[PDB]
């Protein structure tokens, strides 16, 4: 019973149940999908709306961390926003202190270090979100995923959330050497429309963002015309 109450405690098997349980919060969350191309990177996230009466752009899961970089949050949105707020703090320390856009690989490691910190101490809990860091700084288009554990990994393509498995099947059909950001916006949104449960989650939209040559290596929401 006491093996899993806090994240400061390994189990006998050698694992940190509170971090696994935080992971479960992401796997029960709305599906997010992303693709790293030559042209840049694209993030599409399904937002499950609880109500018919929300404004367009309510509970935005995708947030600019810097000009060149954006975090899409799959999981508990509020927790996600604490990571966004930190990723921002790190992005602005890179420009304030080192006069450089933070590199994607760096920004990701910094996001993972932060998320991991919360897995080590009895007083805190793990974050309930996987951050998807999309960046196009001097290290090129980079797509990373920090999970609740703090584990960062680079991806060509990546699916998170309750349709993770099926959305990944569809991401494997894409050739990543070939595809452009303009195709990806189409295919990633198409994937999220396909994998979505129509009977369970009636009200939803697909928030897409990118950072590509097209967008001036600036991390922005894609216009509503490309999205379908």
């Amino acid at each position: 019973s006491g093996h899993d109450q806090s994240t400061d405690v390994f189990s006998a098997e050698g694992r940190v149940f509170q971090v696994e349980y935080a992971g479960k919060a992401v796997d029960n969350s709305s599906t997010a999908v992303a693709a790293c191309c030559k042209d840049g990177v694209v993030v599409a996230v399904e937002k499950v709306h609880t109500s018919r009466m929300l404004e367009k752009g309510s509970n935005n899961r995708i947030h600019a961390v810097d000009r060149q970089a954006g975090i899409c949050i799959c999981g508990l949105l509020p927790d996600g926003r604490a990571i966004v707020s930190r990723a921002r703090q790190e992005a602005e320390n890179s420009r304030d202190i080192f006069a450089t856009p933070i590199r994607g690989s760096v920004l990701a490691n910094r996001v993972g270090e932060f998320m991991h910190a919360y897995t080590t101490h009895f007083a805190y809990r793990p974050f309930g979100c996987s951050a998807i860091i999309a960046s196009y700084a001097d290290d090129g288009p980079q797509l990373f995923v920090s999970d609740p554990s703090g584990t960062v990994a680079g991806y060509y393509g990546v699916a998170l959330g309750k349709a993770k498995t099926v959305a990944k099947s569809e991401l494997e059909k894409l050739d990543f050497s070939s595809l452009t950001c303009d195709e990806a916006v189409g295919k990633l949104a198409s994937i999220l429309h396909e994998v979505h449960d129509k009977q369970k989650d009636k009200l939803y939209e697909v928030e897409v963002a990118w950072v590509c040559d097209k967008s001036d290596r600036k991390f922005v929401h894609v216009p509503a015309d490309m999205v379908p």
Binding site: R67, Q68, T100, P101, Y136, A137, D138, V211, R217
Partner: protein
């Protein structure tokens, strides 16, 4: 203030900027720091305009009396020595960097720096004023003695221009005067025809990349010069 005097064969060229400044405002834009003592002995006046004008008028008056009573031309050495005595006597009361320079038929062209202490050094060329400090390296590098009268004037003007380009306290017109066996040739180069200024030097056209648009790259491009870009 930038004053200099170089020797050529026959005689000397005095050269000077034209700016008196009350610190950071230009009180006079067209001062004449080349001050006649005799027909062919001028001084260049640096420091307190009051103090150098007062000395230059005192020494000019002594030299005129002297010249009348000996019934012959005054030697530059004489002018320098008088100016030294006065600049020394009052060294605590006045701020006065003088260059006495001129022609006399005995010694030809002569230059004397009388700096703030009341030293009197006989030299091939002398620098004076706030702007002098810019020229020492300019002369070391570019000055070649045994110049023509014309080359010395061109050089002296190029010098004064190089000083007043960097010295805030110097600027305006470049006044020269050649003193030799012939009738003195004053000339006044206006700033819009100066032989050098930083504003016109192609070296300093491209602006420092200080401003720099907010970018997704560490690549320095240029200054941001439009809000749209």
């Amino acid at each position: 203030t930038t004053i200099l005097a170089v020797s050529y064969n026959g005689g000397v060229v005095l050269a000077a900027d034209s700016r008196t400044s009350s610190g950071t405002y230009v009180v006079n834009r067209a001062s004449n720091k080349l001050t006649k003592l005799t027909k062919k002995i001028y001084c260049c006046r640096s420091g307190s305009a009051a103090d150098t004008q007062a000395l230059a008028e005192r020494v000019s008056n002594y030299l005129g009396s002297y010249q009348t009573d000996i019934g012959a031309g005054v030697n530059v050495a004489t002018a320098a020595n008088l100016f030294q005595k006065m600049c020394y006597m009052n060294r605590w009361n006045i701020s006065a960097g003088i260059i006495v320079a001129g022609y006399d038929p005995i010694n030809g062209g002569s230059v004397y720096s009388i700096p703030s202490g009341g030293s009197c050094v006989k030299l091939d060329y002398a620098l004076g004023g706030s702007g002098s400090i810019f020229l020492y390296s300019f002369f070391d590098a570019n000055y070649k003695p045994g110049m023509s009268k014309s080359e010395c004037v061109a050089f002296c003007q190029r010098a004064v221009a190089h000083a007043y380009s960097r010295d805030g306290s110097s600027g305006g017109l470049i006044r020269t005067i050649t003193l030799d066996a012939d009738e003195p040739e004053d000339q006044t180069i206006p700033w819009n025809r100066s032989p050098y200024c930083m504003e016109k030097d192609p070296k300093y056209v491209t602006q420092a990349t200080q401003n720099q648009p907010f970018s997704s790259s560490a690549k320095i491009t240029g200054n941001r010069m439009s809000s749209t870009g």
